[PDB]
Amino acid sequence: QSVSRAAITAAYRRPETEAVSMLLEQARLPQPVAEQAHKLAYQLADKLRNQKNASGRAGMGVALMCLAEALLRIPDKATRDALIRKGVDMAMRLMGEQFVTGETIAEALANARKLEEKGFRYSYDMLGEAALTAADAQAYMVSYQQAIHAIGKASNGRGIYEGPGISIKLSALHPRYSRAQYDRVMEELYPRLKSLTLLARQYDIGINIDAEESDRLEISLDLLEKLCFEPELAGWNGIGFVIQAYQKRCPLVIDYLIDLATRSRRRLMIRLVKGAYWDSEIKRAQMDGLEGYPVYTRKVYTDVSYLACAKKLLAVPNLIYPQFATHNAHTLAAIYQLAGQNYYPGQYEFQCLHGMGEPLYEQVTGKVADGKLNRPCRIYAPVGTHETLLAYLVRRLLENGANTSFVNRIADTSLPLDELVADPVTAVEKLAQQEGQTGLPHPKIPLPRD
């Protein structure tokens, strides 16, 4: 292929100067929107950093404090004044616990009330991916079926917006997905996706297809397409799909999705993310030696791409329910303002990962009279034992440990608030004036062919 499909294909690895140049004006916040976004972003980030007065205590050596402490333990003021494989597995469980909501779906669900009453929602992720065998993919299938029964019984008719949903990885459902061919995927994967989706629809819960490596985008779109034309799913808007703003293709995937929502007569639940596989995408493309990268090479370009994509999503509320997944205070504030006046719950939601977003979103989800924005946030809640945790945990270490990540920079008491929540379009224009051109690749990430 269609006009929209062909256009996705042609953007696959387009030069970054080109892709970034096209995004800029789509991403630019109008003057007054930009300033309200800056102000809200500043406030959110200020409260986050300075929760237990962490910077007000910078406002006030360690040898002296130990002495002052000992002096303060003197009860009477008078007296006072007068005077390899195993270490890896273990470190994975230790660092990983904070990102895991529960070992089994019943445990995760039994703990869902606490934040659900404050206005949070959930999307449960049964951990496990990249099934290597037929038996592995069968077992993921059965754990996903079980989970949908449990979530859907706990949802109890609350529906796709207010009620919990599930997130699935297509790589978990087909053996050796990473290299699977079109005909085997449609024969084997598709019937399992279809079957899980019909079930989610019986319980009226959201079912989201997580986005994985970039060479699987095309087949995921083929799968989505067919799924959307199933008669048993006519009139039901519970199908969710993730799109990754770090891809050059993202805006073109949106044009495709908008047309698919129209043709298939539905509102798609669309989770807009930046993306989780960036380090591997770079390594992969550097090993393939092709014309370029399928993702951006500077983090700021991903930020610009997200904003441009978010505007596109928000323009079509009849066709898309945007779910804006982020832990970045500027990103959140920009979307808040871009969504305009006259919020209604079904307009959009935020999303966050368990163990990462609660502090940001405790300022967002909840009543205005408690100093909150009163916007709903859906927590992505991984569910599984230590044997399903590795790959997800590694992605979290990369996310938390990267110096370009907001969650890393916020902890840096030296980087001032204003730089942290700096507007990405303005940042790109600043680079462009310094460097001579808009959208030049990261200086340390040359094209694969070099």
Ligand SMILES: Cc1cc2nc3c(=O)[nH]c(=O)nc-3n(C[C@H](O)[C@H](O)[C@H](O)COP(=O)(O)OP(=O)(O)OC[C@H]3O[C@@H](n4cnc5c(N)ncnc54)[C@H](O)[C@@H]3O)c2cc1C
């Ligand atoms: C609820 C939820 C669901 C998610 N589901 C998925 C999913 O299905 N598939 C998936 O891939 N991701 C998914 N993610 C996104 C991913 O897991 C990260 O959480 C997200 O990319 C971080 O973005 P941020 O705005 O919070 O942080 P920010 O710090 O503002 O942005 C961080 C990121 O920018 C990108 N980046 C980093 N360095 C560079 C660089 N040099 N050049 C270009 N881009 C760079 C990466 O995407 C990285 O995550 C999900 C996130 C959430 C919150």
